[PDB]
RNA sequence: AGCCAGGAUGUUGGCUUAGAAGCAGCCAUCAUUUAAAGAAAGCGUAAUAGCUCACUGGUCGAGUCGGCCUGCGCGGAAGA
């Protein structure tokens, strides 16, 4: 990690993820273990792929600069780190619902679960996604 | 082979010792316990393999006198020899350095002397059969018998590991080449084998533990001698030796003589220590050959050469005198290695 | 109700018998019955094949019930035995292993995929390839 | 504490203090790194 | 710089298959997951277990860090 050559390099990869993505989920594992992601990222690679690259760079001046053009409503996501869980293959897939089940087992804090964009709304839990 | 029976019950005993929760507390025991297992398990496997093969033979031995079952016998007998030959090398597995070979005439006078001549020949011939080397450094003649006393220097590999079992008096019964008559006599030749240990030397002083004192020299002179610390004393803490010196006027000329004498002291005492220890070792290794402190008998009229350490006798003496004692010394080593396992 | 409070990993050379000597003190770590462990152990030797030292997952509970989860055989023994080679490495300037077909590596990787996970299956083959690199094992198609 | 003429850090928990002009080394990890003078 | 997590999977990786499991004289500096993690910096065990640091995320939010050239100092410094 030298400078904006590589910092924005992550931002370039980030813009590619928004290029095909529509919907997102909230998650905050501030106690997250390897074993946690050794299944949850394995489940991603089994469900529909490794497209869900868990980005915990929720800084308002970092990740938000990555996409002020698309999904503008992500402003107040800055504090209390939330990973933009994008859904590329199949808009509105069951990716939110599977971490919702993990929300019951071990996701102590769900970073204020409210349902991300494309209802273009809030708080009401989006379980009505075409599975 | 009965000694190998002790071997298998020792294997059983490993099952009891190795497996106890509190035995691991003793790093001493546990390490040494594991040392045994390394030798134990391999040679136990060796012996248990032997157990099967052996019993197989006797059941199919005198069974119905059929030569077809003898072919089954033929198979396993060839296996048994080659099998135990491998088992023998495992057991024969330290000291392999060069060694001094001392053989000196005992009781029998001139015939005693003459026989050593023939005896020295067999080891030198044995060496040539293995291409080690041989070089003598001292020799005494019995005026008509070759060697009265000869100290050889055998240079090779695994020398002491083979010639270790020659320590003792050798008794020979034969018609002596000095008898006017045609009588039969008994002569003795003592054989000694000691390992060539390195004879390194110390730095001779190592000036860090040398309590050096100085004082007003005691003796004649004048005003000078009354006020001059020209006498030195060197005290060596590891040995506790004291050397006083007051010869020259200068302390340094006097310290010169002091260091010189202390040099001699420790050097010479350490050599005398080793010298006394070697003769100690030697007299408890040679044994005053007086017809009765034997280990092997070379009987010429009957052509037999027997060994009394394992009570084994052989009726093939000519090849032994022609230096082919490899055969003989192999069973001696085998028997001692059998007792080497039951030594702990 | 007692999951991660007592963990130990065992299982050594599977071609042996009752684990009293080599495993004994490790079992005494919780007061576990060595024979009860042996009932799980011997049922695991006969589970696939004997002659392959494997690492097992043992988690003894308060009520003496321990969960045994065996793993895949390590590549060290597999590449050594299945390829029939005995070279190894450690002397890179003098000693190394000859070549071994990639499908051979992949067949072993097929096995370990099923056990050892990740995201990319070809990377799993690359995992035993990494093993191959340090040990001196040369991989070729 | 060891009294010497040269006092270097020994670990990642060593700390250089200058009490009364005497450079003194405290270490709250292993009480053997404690030094003085120099 | 503090304060919250991870710091692992193949791998007790081939010492001379009894042993140094990121840890003595043993090799090479592999491959995944990625917001991240060295087949490694120490302690402890025959070994493990156990606890840290690199590196990496949120947090509060501004200058901080290590070298180089030199002026003047401090310790190194105890006698009748």
Please check whether residue C2 lies inside any domain of the structure. Answer: no
CA nearest A77: which of A57, A98, A91?
A: A57
CATH classification at residue C52 = 3.30.1550.10
Rg (CA), chain A: 14
Q: Which residue has the tokens 């240079």?
A: B155
Strands of the sheet with C66-70, listed across from one edge: C8-10, C56-60, C66-70
Residues C46 and C93 in one domain: no
B214 sits in which H/E element = strand B210-215
Residues C90 and C58 in one domain: no
Phi, psi angles (nearest 5°) of residue C69: -125, 105
C7 touches strand E (CB under 7 A): yes
Residues C64 and C94 in one domain: no
Number of domains in chain C: 2
- Output b/e per residue, C50-68; b: 16+ Cβ within 10 A: eebebebebbbeeeeebeb
- Of C71, C92, C124, which residue constitutes the final position of a domain? C71
- Of C71, C93, C125, which residue constitutes the final position of a domain? C71
Q: Which residue has the tokens 């009781």?
A: B107
Chain C's closest residue to B33, CA to CA, is C21
Residues C52 and C112 in one domain: no
Residues C76 and C135 in one domain: yes
Alpha-carbon separation of residue C45 from B116, B217, C38 (angstroms): 66, 88, 10
Residues C61 and C88 in one domain: no
Question: In the structure encoding, which two tokens stand for residue C111, read together?
Answer: 């096995």
Burial (Cβ within 10 Å: 0-12, 13-18, ≥19) of residue B123: buried
Question: How far is residue B59's CA from residue B65's CA, in Å, rounded to a whole number?
Answer: 12
In this complex, the nucleotide whose C1' atom is nearest to the CA atom of residue D29 is E43
Residues C20 and C56 in one domain: yes
The dihedral built from the CA positions of residue B93, B94, B98 and B101, taken in this order, carries a sign that is: negative
How many angstroms from the chain centroid is the CA of residue A50?
13
- Chain-chain contact of C117 with A41 (C-beta, under 8 angstroms): no
- In the stretch 26-65 of chain A, residues with CB closer than 8 A to chain C read 38, 41-42, 44-45, 50
For residues B127 and B149, is the Cβ–Cβ distance under 8 A? Answer: no
Alpha-carbon separation of residue B285 from B97, B169, B278 (angstroms): 18, 10, 10
Residues C32 and C53 in one domain: yes
Question: How far is residue C27's CA from residue B19's CA, in Å, rounded to a whole number?
Answer: 10
Residues C64 and C42 in one domain: yes
Query: End-to-end alpha-carbon separation of chain C, Å?
Result: 50
For residues B27 and B8, is the Cβ–Cβ distance under 8 A? Answer: no
A104 touches strand E (CB under 7 A): no
Largest CA distance in chain B: 115
* B192: β partners: B102
Q: Which residues form the domain of C57?
A: 7-71
Q: Which chains touch B (3 or more CB pairs under 8 A)?
A: C
Residues C100 and C42 in one domain: no
Phi, psi angles (nearest 5°) of residue B234: -110, 120
- Output b/e per residue, B211-242; b: 16+ Cβ within 10 A: eeeeeebeeeeeeebeebebbbebebeeeeee
Residues C97 and C86 in one domain: yes
Question: How far is residue B246's CA from residue B270's CA, in Å, rounded to a whole number?
Answer: 26
Data resolution in angstroms:
3.7
CATH classification at residue A59 = 3.30.70.1730
Q: Which residue has the tokens 């190592």?
A: B206
Q: Which residue has the tokens 């990716």?
A: A95
Question: How far is residue B143's CA from residue C106's CA, in Å, rounded to a whole number?
Answer: 84
Measure the CA angle with vertex B49, ends B45 and B55; round to 5°.
145
Residues C77 and C27 in one domain: no
Q: Spell out which residues of chain C touch residue A45, defining contact as CB-CB under 8 Å.
A: 118-120
Residues 6+ apart with CB under 8 A from B7: B43, B44, B47, B338, B341, B342
In this complex, the nucleotide whose C1' atom is nearest to the CA atom of residue A80 is E58
Q: Which of residues 9-28 of A touch strand E (CB under 7 A)?
A: 10
Number of domains in chain A: 1
CA nearest B102: which of B128, B49, B139, B62?
A: B139
Question: How far is residue D9's CA from residue B39's CA, in Å, rounded to a whole number?
Answer: 49
Question: In the structure encoding, which two tokens stand for residue B5, read together?
Answer: 């029976």
Q: Which residue has the tokens 């946690």?
A: A36
Please check whether residue C1 lies inside any domain of the structure. Answer: no
- Spatial distance from the CA of B39 to the C1' of E16 (Å): 15
- The experimental method, as deposited, was cryo-EM
Q: Which residues form the domain of A43?
A: 1-130
- Of C45, C71, C97, which residue constitutes the final position of a domain? C71
């Amino acid at each position: 990690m030298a400078l904006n050559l590589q910092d924005k390099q992550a931002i370039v990869a980030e813009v590619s993820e928004v290029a095909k993505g529509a919907l997102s989920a909230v998650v905050a594992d501030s106690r997250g273990v390897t074993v946690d992601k050794m299944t949850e990222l394995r489940k991603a690679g089994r469900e529909a792929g490794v497209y869900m690259r868990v980005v915990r760079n929720t800084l308002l001046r970092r990740a938000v600069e990555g996409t002020p053009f698309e999904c503008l409503k992500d402003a107040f996501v800055g504090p209390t780190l939330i990973a933009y869980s994008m859904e590329h293959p199949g808009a509105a897939a069951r990716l939110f619902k599977e971490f919702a089940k993990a929300n019951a087992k071990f996701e102590v804090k769900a970073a204020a679960f409210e349902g991300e964009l494309i209802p273009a709304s809030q708080i009401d839990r989006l379980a009505t996604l075409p599975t | 082979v009965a000694k190998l029976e002790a071997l298998h019950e020792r294997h059983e005993e490993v099952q009891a010792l190795l497996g106890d929760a509190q035995t691991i507390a003793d790093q001493e025991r546990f390490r040494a316990l594991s040392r045994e297992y390394a030798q134990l398990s391999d040679v136990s496997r060796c012996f248990t393999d032997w157990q099967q093969v052996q019993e197989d033979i006797e059941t199919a031995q005198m069974m119905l006198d059929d030569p077809e079952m003898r072919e089954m016998a033929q198979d396993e007998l060839r296996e048994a020899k080659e099998k135990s030959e491998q088992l023998e090398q495992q057991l024969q597995v330290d000291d392999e350095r060069n060694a001094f070979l001392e053989v000196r005439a005992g009781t029998g006078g001139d015939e005693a002397a003459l026989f050593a001549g023939d005896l020295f020949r067999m080891y030198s011939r044995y060496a040539e059969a293995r291409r080690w080397r041989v070089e003598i450094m001292s020799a005494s003649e019995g005026e008509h018998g070759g060697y009265k006393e000869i100290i050889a220097k055998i240079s090779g590999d695994g020398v002491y590991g083979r010639l270790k079992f020659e320590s003792g008096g050798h008794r020979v019964q034969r018609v002596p080449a000095t008898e006017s008559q045609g009588r039969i006599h008994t002569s003795a030749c003592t054989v000694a084998v000691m390992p060539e240990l390195p004879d390194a030397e110390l730095p001779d002083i190592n000036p860090a533990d040398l309590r050096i004192d100085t004082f007003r020299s005691s003796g004649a002179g004048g005003q000078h001698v009354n006020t001059t610390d020209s006498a030195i004393r060197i005290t060596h803490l590891p040995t506790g030796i004291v050397v006083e010196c007051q010869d020259e006027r200068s302390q340094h000329k006097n310290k010169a003589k002091a260091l010189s004498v202390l040099g001699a002291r420790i050097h010479a005492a350490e050599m005398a220590k080793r010298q006394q220890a070697e003769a100690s070792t030697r007299r408890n290794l040679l044994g005053s050959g007086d017809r009765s402190d034997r280990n092997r008998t070379y009987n010429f009229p009957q052509g037999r050469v027997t060994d009394h350490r394992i009570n084994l006798t052989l009726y093939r003496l000519d090849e032994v005198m022609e230096g082919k004692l490899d055969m003989l010394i192999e069973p001696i080593i085998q028997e001692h290695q059998a007792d080497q396992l039951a030594a702990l | 109700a007692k999951k991660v409070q007592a963990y130990v990993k065992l299982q050594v050379a599977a071609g042996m018998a009752n684990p009293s000597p080599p495993v004994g003190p490790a079992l005494g770590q919780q007061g576990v019955n060595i024979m009860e462990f042996c009932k799980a152990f011997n049922a695991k030797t006969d589970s696939i094949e004997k002659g392959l030292p494997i690492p097992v997952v043992i988690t003894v509970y308060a009520d003496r019930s321990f969960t045994f989860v065996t793993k895949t055989p390590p590549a060290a023994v597999l590449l050594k035995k299945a390829a029939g080679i005995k070279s190894g490495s450690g002397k890179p300037n003098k000693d190394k292993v000859g070549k071994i077909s990639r499908a051979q590596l992949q067949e072993i990787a097929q096995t370990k995929a099923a056990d050892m996970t990740g995201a990319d299956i070809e990377a799993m083959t690359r995992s035993i390839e990494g093993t191959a690199r340090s040990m001196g094992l040369v991989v070729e198609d | 504490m060891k009294v010497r003429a040269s006092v270097k850090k020994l670990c990642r928990n060593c700390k250089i203090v200058k009490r009364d002009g005497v450079i003194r080394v405290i270490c709250s990890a292993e009480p053997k790194h404690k030094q003085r003078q120099g």
